[PDB]
Amino acid sequence: SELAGHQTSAESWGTGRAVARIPRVRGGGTHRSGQGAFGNMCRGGRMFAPTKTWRRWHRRVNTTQKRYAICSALAASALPALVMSKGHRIEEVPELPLVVEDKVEGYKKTKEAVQLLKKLKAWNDIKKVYASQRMRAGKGKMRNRRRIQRRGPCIIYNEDNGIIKAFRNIPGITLLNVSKLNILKLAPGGHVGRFCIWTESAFRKLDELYGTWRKAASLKSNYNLPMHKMMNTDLSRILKSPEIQRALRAPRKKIHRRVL
Amino acid sequence: APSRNGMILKPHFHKDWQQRVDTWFNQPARKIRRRKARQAKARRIAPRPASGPIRPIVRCPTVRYHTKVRAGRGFSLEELRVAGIHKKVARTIGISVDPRRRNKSTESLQANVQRLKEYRSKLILFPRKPSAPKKGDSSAEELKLATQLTGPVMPIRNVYKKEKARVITEEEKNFKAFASLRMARANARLFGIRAKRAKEAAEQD
Amino acid sequence: MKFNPFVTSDRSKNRKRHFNAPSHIRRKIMSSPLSKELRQKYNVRSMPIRKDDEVQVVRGHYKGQQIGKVVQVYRKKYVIYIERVQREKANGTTVHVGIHPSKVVITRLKLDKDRKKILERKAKSRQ
RNA sequence: CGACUCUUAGCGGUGGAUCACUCGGCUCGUGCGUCGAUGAAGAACGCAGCUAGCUGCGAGAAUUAAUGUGAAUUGCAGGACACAUUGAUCAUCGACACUUCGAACGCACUUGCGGCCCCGGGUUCCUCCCGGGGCUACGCCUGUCUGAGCGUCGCUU
RNA sequence: GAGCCUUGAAGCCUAGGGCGCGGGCCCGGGUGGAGCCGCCGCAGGUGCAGAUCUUGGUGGUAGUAGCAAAUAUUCAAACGAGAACUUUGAAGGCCGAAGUGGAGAAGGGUUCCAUGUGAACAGCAGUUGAACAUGGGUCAGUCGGUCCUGAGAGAUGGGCG
RNA sequence: UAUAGGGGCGAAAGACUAAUCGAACCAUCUAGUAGCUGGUUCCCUCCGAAGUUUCCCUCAGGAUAGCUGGCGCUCUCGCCC
RNA sequence: CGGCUACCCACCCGACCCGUCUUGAAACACGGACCAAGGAGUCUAACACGUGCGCGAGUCGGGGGCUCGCACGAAAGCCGCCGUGGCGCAAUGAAGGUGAAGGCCGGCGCGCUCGCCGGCCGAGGUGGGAUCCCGAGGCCUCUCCAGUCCGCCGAGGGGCACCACCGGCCCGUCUCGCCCGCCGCGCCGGGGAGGUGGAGCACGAGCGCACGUGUUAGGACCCGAAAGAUGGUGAACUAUG
RNA sequence: CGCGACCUCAGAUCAGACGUGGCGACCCGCUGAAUUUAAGCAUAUUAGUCAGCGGAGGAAAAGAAACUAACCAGGAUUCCCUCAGUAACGGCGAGUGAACAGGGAAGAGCCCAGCGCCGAAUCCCCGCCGCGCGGGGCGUGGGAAAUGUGGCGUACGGAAGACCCACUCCCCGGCGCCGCUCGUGGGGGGCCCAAGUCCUUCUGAUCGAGGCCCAGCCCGUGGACGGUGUGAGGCCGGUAGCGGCCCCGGCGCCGGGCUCGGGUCUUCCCGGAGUCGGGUUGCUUGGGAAUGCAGCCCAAAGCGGGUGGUAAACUCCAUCUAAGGCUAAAUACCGGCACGAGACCGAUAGUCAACAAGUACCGUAAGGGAAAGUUGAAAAGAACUUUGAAGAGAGAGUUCAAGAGGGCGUGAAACCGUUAAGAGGUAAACGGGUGGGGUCCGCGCAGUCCGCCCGGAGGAUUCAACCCGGCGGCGGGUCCGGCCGUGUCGGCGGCCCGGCGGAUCUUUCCCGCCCCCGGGGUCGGCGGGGGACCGUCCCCCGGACCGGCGACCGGCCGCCGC
Numbered sequence A: 001s002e003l004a005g006h007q008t009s010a011e012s013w014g015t016g017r018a019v020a021r022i023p024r025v026r027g028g029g030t031h032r033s034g035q036g037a038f039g040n041m042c043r044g045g046r047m048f049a050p051t052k053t054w055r056r057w058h059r060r061v062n063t064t065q066k067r068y069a070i071c072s073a074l075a076a077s078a079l080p081a082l083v084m085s086k087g088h089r090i091e092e093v094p095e096l097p098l099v100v101e102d103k104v105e106g107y108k109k110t111k112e113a114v115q116l117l118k119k120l121k122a123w124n125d126i127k128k129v130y131a132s133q134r135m136r137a138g139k140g141k142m143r144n145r146r147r148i149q150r151r152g153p154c155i156i157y158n159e160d161n162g163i164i165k166a167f168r169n170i171p172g173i174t175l176l177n178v179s180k181l182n183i184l185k186l187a188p189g190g191h192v193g194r195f196c197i198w199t200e201s202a203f204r205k206l207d208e209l210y211g212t213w214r215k216a217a218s219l220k221s222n223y224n225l226p227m228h229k230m231m232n233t234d235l236s237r238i239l240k241s242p243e244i245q246r247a248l249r250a251p252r253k254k255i256h257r258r259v260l
Numbered sequence B: 001a002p003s004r005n006g007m008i009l010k011p012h013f014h015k016d017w018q019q020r021v022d023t024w025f026n027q028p029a030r031k032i033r034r035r036k037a038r039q040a041k042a043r044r045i046a047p048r049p050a051s052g053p054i055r056p057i058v059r060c061p062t063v064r065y066h067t068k069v070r071a072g073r074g075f076s077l078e079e080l081r082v083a084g085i086h087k088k089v090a091r092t093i094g095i096s097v098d099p100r101r102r103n104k105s106t107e108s109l110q111a112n113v114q115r116l117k118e119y120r121s122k123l124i125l126f127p128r129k130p131s132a133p134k135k136g137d138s139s140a141e142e143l144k145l146a147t148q149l150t151g152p153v154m155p156i157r158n159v160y161k162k163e164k165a166r167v168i169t170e171e172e173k174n175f176k177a178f179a180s181l182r183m184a185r186a187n188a189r190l191f192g193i194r195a196k197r198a199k200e201a202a203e204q205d
Numbered sequence C: 001m002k003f004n005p006f007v008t009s010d011r012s013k014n015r016k017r018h019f020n021a022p023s024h025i026r027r028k029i030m031s032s033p034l035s036k037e038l039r040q041k042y043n044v045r046s047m048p049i050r051k052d053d054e055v056q057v058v059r060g061h062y063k064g065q066q067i068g069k070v071v072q073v074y075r076k077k078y079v080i081y082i083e084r085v086q087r088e089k090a091n092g093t094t095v096h097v098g099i100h101p102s103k104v105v106i107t108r109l110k111l112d113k114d115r116k117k118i119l120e121r122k123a124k125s126r127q
Numbered sequence D: 001c002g003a004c005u006c007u008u009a010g011c012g013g014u015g016g017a018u019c020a021c022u023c024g025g026c027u028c029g030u031g032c033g034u035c036g037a038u039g040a041a042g043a044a045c046g047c048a049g050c051u052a053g054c055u056g057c058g059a060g061a062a063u064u065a066a067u068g069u070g071a072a073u074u075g076c077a078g079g080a081c082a083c084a085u086u087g088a089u090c091a092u093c094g095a096c097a098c099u100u101c102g103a104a105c106g107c108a109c110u111u112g113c114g115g116c117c118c119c120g121g122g123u124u125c126c127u128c129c130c131g132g133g134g135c136u137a138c139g140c141c142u143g144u145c146u147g148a149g150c151g152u153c154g155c156u157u
Numbered sequence E: 001g002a003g004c005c006u007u008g009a010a011g012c013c014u015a016g017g018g019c020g021c022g023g024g025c026c027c028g029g030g031u032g033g034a035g036c037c038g039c040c041g042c043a044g045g046u047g048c049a050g051a052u053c054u055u056g057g058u059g060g061u062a063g064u065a066g067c068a069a070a071u072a073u074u075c076a077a078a079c080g081a082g083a084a085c086u087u088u089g090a091a092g093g094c095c096g097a098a099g100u101g102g103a104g105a106a107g108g109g110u111u112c113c114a115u116g117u118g119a120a121c122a123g124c125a126g127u128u129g130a131a132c133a134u135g136g137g138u139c140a141g142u143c144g145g146u147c148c149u150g151a152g153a154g155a156u157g158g159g160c161g
Numbered sequence F: 001u002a003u004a005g006g007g008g009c010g011a012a013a014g015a016c017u018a019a020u021c022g023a024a025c026c027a028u029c030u031a032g033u034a035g036c037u038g039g040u041u042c043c044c045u046c047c048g049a050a051g052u053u054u055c056c057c058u059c060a061g062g063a064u065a066g067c068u069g070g071c072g073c074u075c076u077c078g079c080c081c
Numbered sequence G: 001c002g003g004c005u006a007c008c009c010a011c012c013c014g015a016c017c018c019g020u021c022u023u024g025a026a027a028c029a030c031g032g033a034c035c036a037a038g039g040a041g042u043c044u045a046a047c048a049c050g051u052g053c054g055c056g057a058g059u060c061g062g063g064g065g066c067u068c069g070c071a072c073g074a075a076a077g078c079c080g081c082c083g084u085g086g087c088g089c090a091a092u093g094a095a096g097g098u099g100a101a102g103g104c105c106g107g108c109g110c111g112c113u114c115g116c117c118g119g120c121c122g123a124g125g126u127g128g129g130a131u132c133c134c135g136a137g138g139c140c141u142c143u144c145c146a147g148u149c150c151g152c153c154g155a156g157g158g159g160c161a162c163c164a165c166c167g168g169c170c171c172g173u174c175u176c177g178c179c180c181g182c183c184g185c186g187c188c189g190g191g192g193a194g195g196u197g198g199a200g201c202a203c204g205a206g207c208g209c210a211c212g213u214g215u216u217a218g219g220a221c222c223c224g225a226a227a228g229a230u231g232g233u234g235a236a237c238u239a240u241g
Numbered sequence H: 001c002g003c004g005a006c007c008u009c010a011g012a013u014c015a016g017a018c019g020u021g022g023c024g025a026c027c028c029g030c031u032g033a034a035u036u037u038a039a040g041c042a043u044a045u046u047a048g049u050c051a052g053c054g055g056a057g058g059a060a061a062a063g064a065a066a067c068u069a070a071c072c073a074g075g076a077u078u079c080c081c082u083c084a085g086u087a088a089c090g091g092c093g094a095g096u097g098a099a100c101a102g103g104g105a106a107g108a109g110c111c112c113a114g115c116g117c118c119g120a121a122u123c124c125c126c127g128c129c130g131c132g133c134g135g136g137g138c139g140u141g142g143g144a145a146a147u148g149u150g151g152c153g154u155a156c157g158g159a160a161g162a163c164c165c166a167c168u169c170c171c172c173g174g175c176g177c178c179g180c181u182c183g184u185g186g187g188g189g190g191c192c193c194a195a196g197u198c199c200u201u202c203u204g205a206u207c208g209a210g211g212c213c214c215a216g217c218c219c220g221u222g223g224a225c226g227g228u229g230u231g232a233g234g235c236c237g238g239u240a241g242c243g244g245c246c247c248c249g250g251c252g253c254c255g256g257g258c259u260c261g262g263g264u265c266u267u268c269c270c271g272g273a274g275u276c277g278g279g280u281u282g283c284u285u286g287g288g289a290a291u292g293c294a295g296c297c298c299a300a301a302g303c304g305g306g307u308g309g310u311a312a313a314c315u316c317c318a319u320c321u322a323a324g325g326c327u328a329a330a331u332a333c334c335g336g337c338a339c340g341a342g343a344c345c346g347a348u349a350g351u352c353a354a355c356a357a358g359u360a361c362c363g364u365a366a367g368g369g370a371a372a373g374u375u376g377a378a379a380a381g382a383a384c385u386u387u388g389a390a391g392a393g394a395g396a397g398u399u400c401a402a403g404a405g406g407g408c409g410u411g412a413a414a415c416c417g418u419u420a421a422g423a424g425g426u427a428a429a430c431g432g433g434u435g436g437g438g439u440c441c442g443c444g445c446a447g448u449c450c451g452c453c454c455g456g457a458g459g460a461u462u463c464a465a466c467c468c469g470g471c472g473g474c475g476g477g478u479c480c481g482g483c484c485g486u487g488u489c490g491g492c493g494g495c496c497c498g499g500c501g502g503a504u505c506u507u508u509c510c511c512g513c514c515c516c517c518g519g520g521g522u523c524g525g526c527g528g529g530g531g532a533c534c535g536u537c538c539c540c541c542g543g544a545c546c547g548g549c550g551a552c553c554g555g556c557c558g559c560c561g562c
């Protein structure tokens, strides 16, 4: 409140009145007359360095770095290892990028939505979400936050026809658009590899929204796909290739321990 | 107070500044209010376009920006007179009028009156009853569109003369030079002095 | 999920508005479900509790199939009293035990001119 | 052997720390833009069946009238229980009412002292006789009435 | 973490077992009764032995100093569980009329009276009280205010601002 | 009843002005400034001083240099010189 | 039977009571009776360096606008003829102002302390310089024959970055003299050779975001004055009418 | 002498009407310090801030140039980003510090005094007459204001008056109604989906696994709250251009009153004064030979006056018309009435105040100002017997729990009492190393180690060796019938039934302007559109490399299970 301690009018005693030198309130007939005034070490006083409202809350990020992170999350969501190591149940899923027809965006009821999620063998993750819905831990329950819900699949769509209604009641689900890709929803908690469910048009629009290494993006004016550093990211084949081992040194696997 | 090496600083925080600090925590709310106001105004004035009043062609005054052209406030009374429409009717027609602006160049006067003529030719207004003239039987099914964005008829996008390529003439090798600009500056600096010298010389005769 | 920007999800605000609710809102809060054979008859799910209607406890300590009747609706305590759901004091005198109306199911209603109107309104709104 | 003292553990007492809860704050944003001479803010007094404070009210005083809702309030007896009459509580609140001081307005405020008009009772009347009702502050605006000017003017004694 | 929990969460205690050099942590047991924690990152109003530090509580001192300004109390009885402090009677004394008397103004505001209990107040005690609870109590033409001016304060006319 | 704070009042002690008077009390500026005292909270590992030069109304201080630590970077040995 | 320990007891040895000011503390120097809770380097703006990231002579939409009304949305997505604009890409003078390419070859005019012409690549040279290239020489079953097979090196060459020097170019100055041009033949302009001053050029590296340290202005690590100003309350005590 | 009119004026409890004061977060006018910094302090900074006074509104002020610039000029005002920590100010020290551009949000412009014309065609009041719901304005007649000057017509962007020319029939104020207004206009009351079913813990259930092969049911409703704990379905509530009911405001249509614009020509008119400016003295500003304001003095002109950032004279140029006024917009809001949210606080924290808090209490007064939450799911608050006069206690009783017994959840430390153990002349305590006692822990103590292989002692089983049927996976050869990646041509083909960019072009292409003599002449130029070449992309054939994390069949070796 910026006035947590300076509501009391008080002055210090001084040399005499050997009780202390901290300012003390003036008055009488009250057991609060003569206590500690505003201060850090005093009871009922202001705190050290009162938190101001003009603190730097928001942090801006370059748009190129934002797009880099989005493409990184999209590329990580296509690898089965990275999405399996996050916690999603993809053991029965036929194809990791689940690209379905355009009929799903025209859904109006949630019964057909649950039927589609069960047919695509993605219902195990929603069942895990249902099972893990414990209560918030600590003092966060008082501040209107009493539920812990784990994140499930996110259906990325375009040209909404009522799919938000059909996917707005399933717990752990996330609704995302191709034209508005959010890192907070694609990589929750700072870890890449979230299970994704796409649509035909949502999957065909990615080549035009981000572009390839040959042609730039059509929707974004001056954006191109990020450059690729190591063309072959497999160290095993490189180290075991004959060209590398053609001019290597002897192994020399002798220990040569200490001699007494 | 100073350190080993550093830029000398003079921060303007000696005043009592903490009691007057404007934090922009209401910026999204302000943008939402402005967007809602724009939408409400456009919906109320739907047959008329957003930023309705047409704005003339305006050159920047200073020498730093006088190479580009920009929009302005209103057309001049001379431009209205060359266009042939009355001054007071242009306001209800949808033509912003600036009575304070003057016209010094016919090159801009012709451009402004041409813009006015184009706006008048593209303009289609609605009557109260079909007894009003200067209209058609059907209003192009709401004129194919109700509202326009970012300029009523056309923005102020810059155009440039091409002057693609040409053959160099004979005397172009010795036509201009840095000495030409130097002589021009010297004459501009010593113009009046030479006149006074010629005057005092003719005085002696 | 909540979508109206004019209704709150604050736990403290909800608790305050529930504990300091007026008497005409307490009667709506103190509502009890109806029996299965009566729900299909009246085409309504729940109904507020009054003084004359009979009721049957479904959950709690004094639960069973014994049909009972309410004698007091204590709106201040969000509770109702039943003549047979009682307890003995130290000296042996009887005193009613309080059970919440949400933990009790109704079997009989007083057919009043206003009760029939509420029933038909709820039925026409459920359609 | 006992008593006293010291160190540990169990239990007990003073003590009210930690933990859990929160009808409370702090911050941010949104909507509206509202006091009074037709009596504002604030203050005093009083009002409940039993009632001290907070809250809510003004001698119609823990609320009146009307509308919506529909069977109660509650600490205790009573009480309208009546609803094929008008029907409890609650909320809304546009209709009535709103004591004294307070810009406070009859003078001052020690609740005194008046002054006019009207209505009921007193010698059926004024003349410093009781009760009740209305008016009786300052400045200023428009108009009316009253009247002062060896300020200017015309006719006249 | 398809984490642990009303077959027992947090917290607290413990001559129990054990780990880490250490900050600390794990398990067993006893209370307790509704939440909590590990891992990956993020942000702090984040670690106390002191500051004649702030608040609250508790010890040695210590059952110690102290209940000593103004001559003084005693006997019998009653009401009471309880008597030195209350009541009645008697004896011995003080204030001795500039009082330890009878009335007032300021100030206090129910402290005045009757009944009733005896944990708190009365520096011991109490059947007692100016304490507590209940109920009563202030009657004016001729008592004073109200009237009048005194020193003095003060609005309008006017002036200044 | 009148005089109210750089004012009042003073048979003058700078005495009195609500337990405060060689300048009252109350609230705000104000979290006034201090080269001056006091305090400043968890573990382990590694490195580890100075009280000295010059200048300053400088001597209980600061600036500069020096002492110290961290981040590195550029090369050199590792197979008669 | 075995058991260190946060249980108690005893002996042997060593053992002064903690914190900070100080050359010197256990001090006859200061604070601490004890216990529980609270308690002190924070945040903003700016600067310097270092590190991580993205782009790159470019970089940055933080300011606005667009899509659809939204719990999560005070988020996120986009602007592309919104880059206006900030930083950097050019510096030097007080200013009028000016404002950065060298090297080889041949010729002519006195190849003159001497300018121009023509051709080429195009940011000079010296001494060091990681690395790279060439490389005599020898190192693998009986033999003249070979491409891989075993496999290092004397010497030599072009030389990253960086270091020192010389020379070169730009701007402000001082000395010396001569030449060229005319939108007008002048106290008009331009040019050279030498010495100096610049935060300069001599194939550019910055921008935006985050973190850490250091300095500084904000009350700024926390607690602490003697005092100053503004506006009000007191003559119920006391001094005086 | 009197009467009357005018003019400066007085009184009323004359008729009607208005202001006072309060809040004051935001705004406007005035003056208004010091602590601090300058390591001291006077100028300066703090600051044209705090305190003080006067006023109003949801906003106020500002606002239509006596403006900015000096070139291809722009054009009210307000707010944001840049300009810019710059120009500049300063014991030029500390420090202070704008403005014009430009891009954005919003963009609404006008009136009057004067000069002239209109028989004052103007305005207020009073009273009867013709009108409508909740009550005020239209037509009639007299009493005043006003010729020392009402009103239309007029406003520097010119205007007025008189001919000529070709035109325009409209707009503004109530009354009754149907259908809508963008979240599907605003306000208010009530209603609307889906388990409480089986089994088992628990005082209590919302705990615990499932509900046939269509996954027990709903979901546009799985946010939250209350309910004996931890609920999507038991209950208000939430989603829903969901429904029905009541109240208020506008869009189209039936009576009533006003009502000539545009251009050329001819004629006339055209302006704010103790004010600008100057001298001087203070305050202020970055404003410097003085930015602005104020006090005194001097105090004008109409080819004039102001400004052009260095004072003064001569000349030219650019811009504006000040001493009169009104106006919503984007802007601010710590007060007020309601609402929503939180990486904030969780009872020594957070506002002083979570509770009978600006309360108790303190000082005469201004003023100062606290402490203080938790029984239990439900009082179900301990009947009754006994001791004591009572406080209190022993039994008993409710609750799962009294180890929750009326400031009672949990219940630490300091301190104290009791019980048990040990010890005691160098105060206690402490580190190194042992010993003794005790609690407790693990083992059952001359009797306890595990797994593999082989040789023996007895019983029961199918498989393994091998073959056959057969599926699933691995490996490479032919890359076989096909898949795509990396490059070069090619069908010039998808250019018209394919996309982007390019200061690369095509004036012998078009459209709209323009120059010269309707038409002609490219003689030249401007904007838009069409199309030719360039660098990036879409299909088949032919081949160049990898067949690699892109994959199928045919055939083979070698595995696994059935």
Ligand SMILES: [Mg+2]
Binding pocket: A004, A005, A044, A045, A046
């Ligand atoms: Mg506080």
Ligand SMILES: [Mg+2]
Binding pocket: A006
């Ligand atoms: Mg403050």
Ligand SMILES: [Mg+2]
Binding pocket: A006, A007, A008, A009
């Ligand atoms: Mg204060």
Ligand SMILES: [Mg+2]
Binding pocket: A138
């Ligand atoms: Mg916790």
Ligand SMILES: [Mg+2]
Binding pocket: none
């Ligand atoms: Mg330092």
Ligand SMILES: [Mg+2]
Binding pocket: C010, C012
């Ligand atoms: Mg809240």
Ligand SMILES: [Mg+2]
Binding pocket: none
């Ligand atoms: Mg204890």
Ligand SMILES: [Mg+2]
Binding pocket: none
């Ligand atoms: Mg009523």
Ligand SMILES: [Mg+2]
Binding pocket: none
């Ligand atoms: Mg008065």
Ligand SMILES: [Mg+2]
Binding pocket: none
């Ligand atoms: Mg009266």
Ligand SMILES: [Mg+2]
Binding pocket: none
């Ligand atoms: Mg238990």
Ligand SMILES: [Mg+2]
Binding pocket: none
């Ligand atoms: Mg509980």
Ligand SMILES: [Mg+2]
Binding pocket: none
């Ligand atoms: Mg802290």
Ligand SMILES: [Mg+2]
Binding pocket: none
């Ligand atoms: Mg402590």
Ligand SMILES: [Mg+2]
Binding pocket: E052
């Ligand atoms: Mg102390």
Ligand SMILES: [Mg+2]
Binding pocket: none
């Ligand atoms: Mg306490």
